[PDB]
């Protein structure tokens, strides 16, 4: 019993974290096989950030200008190219600790674990969610660029995020491992703004199922509802439109608990209107939405890696 914001075991990723230095600027890199992935603004300085011409700035760089340190062992850079907003440093040694790994681009609403690194040394791990506006409510200080986000399946690490920037509102923006930003942001120190952020409805529903699974049940009712009678209230409280796809993805949890999706939906409707009125759910007076349906099954069934 119990339900916590659980992050993936980070052991496989820690062995891939290296440091990447370029003049005065240090950040983090990801060492997989004989390539080190890192954000391209490592070639920038603290005065080349308003509107940096990355093409030109890279031209003036050679292999030797990239200091790549795995621990205190320097890695020889034998190549370098730029793919979107990320930099690929070809090194002469394949990482012995390379895990089984893929690159994926997640969708808004999906979650992943962030391994926050500084100077190439992992310092903390936490679970985050790709918010609908394509930002993340992370915890990042200067030097955290190159920190990666990831999921695990069996023994295959799926890297889905590399950290680049902090937006003016304190939220964070980054890329997939191909260098394509999530959302419309760019790696320049300009005034960019995140769109309006909704709540991830399908994730809150999964969270309630995890509540029921754990014995929190003051919120269930006998009333049920339709999908469209529900979305009318959803679109009223800045909630994502629930689709049949979402109802389907919640199938395995409805079956496990016995509560139909639409009944738990109605329970959410009154929680949205009347509220919690003092009582908590899984230790929270707010409706958590950073748990996917698979996030609940993994935690509640003890899936291991």
């Amino acid at each position: 019993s119990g339900f916590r914001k659980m992050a993936f075991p980070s052991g496989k990723v820690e062995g891939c974290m290296v440091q990447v230095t370029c003049g005065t600027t240090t950040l983090n890199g990801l060492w997989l096989d004989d390539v080190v992935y890192c954000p391209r603004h490592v070639i920038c300085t603290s005065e080349d950030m308003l509107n940096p011409n990355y093409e030109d700035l890279l031209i003036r760089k050679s292999n030797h200008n990239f200091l790549v340190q795995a621990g205190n062992v320097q890695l020889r850079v034998i190549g370098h190219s730029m793919q979107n907003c990320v930099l690929k440093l070809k090194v002469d040694t394949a990482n012995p600790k390379t895990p089984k790994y893929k690159f994926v681009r997640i969708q808004p609403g999906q979650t992943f674990s962030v391994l926050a690194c500084y100077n190439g040394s992992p310092s903390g791990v936490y679970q985050c969610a790709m918010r609908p506006n394509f930002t993340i409510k992370g915890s990042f200080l200067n030097g955290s660029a190159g920190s990666v986000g990831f999921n695990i399946d069996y023994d295959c690490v799926s890297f889905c995020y590399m950290h680049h920037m902090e937006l003016p509102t304190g939220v964070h923006a980054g890329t997939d491992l191909e260098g394509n930003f999530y959302g419309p942001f760019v790696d320049r120190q300009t005034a960019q703004a995140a769109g309006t952020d909704t709540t991830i409805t399908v994730n809150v529903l999964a969270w309630l199922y995890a509540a029921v699974i754990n014995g929190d049940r003051w919120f269930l009712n006998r009333f049920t509802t339709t999908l469209n009678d529900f979305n009318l209230v959803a679109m009223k409280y800045n909630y994502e439109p629930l689709t049949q796809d979402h109802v389907d993805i919640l199938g395995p949890l409805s079956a496990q608990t016995g509560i139909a999706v639409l009944d738990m939906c109605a329970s959410l409707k009154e929680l949205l209107q009347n509220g919690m009125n003092g009582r908590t759910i899984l230790g929270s007076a707010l409706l958590e939405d950073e748990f996917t349906p698979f996030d609940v099954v993994r935690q509640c069934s003890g899936v291991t890696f």
Binding site: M49, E166, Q189
Partner: peptide, 6 residues
């Protein structure tokens, strides 16, 4: 306020 590359 402007974005901060970290």
């Amino acid at each position: 306020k402007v974005a901060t590359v970290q």
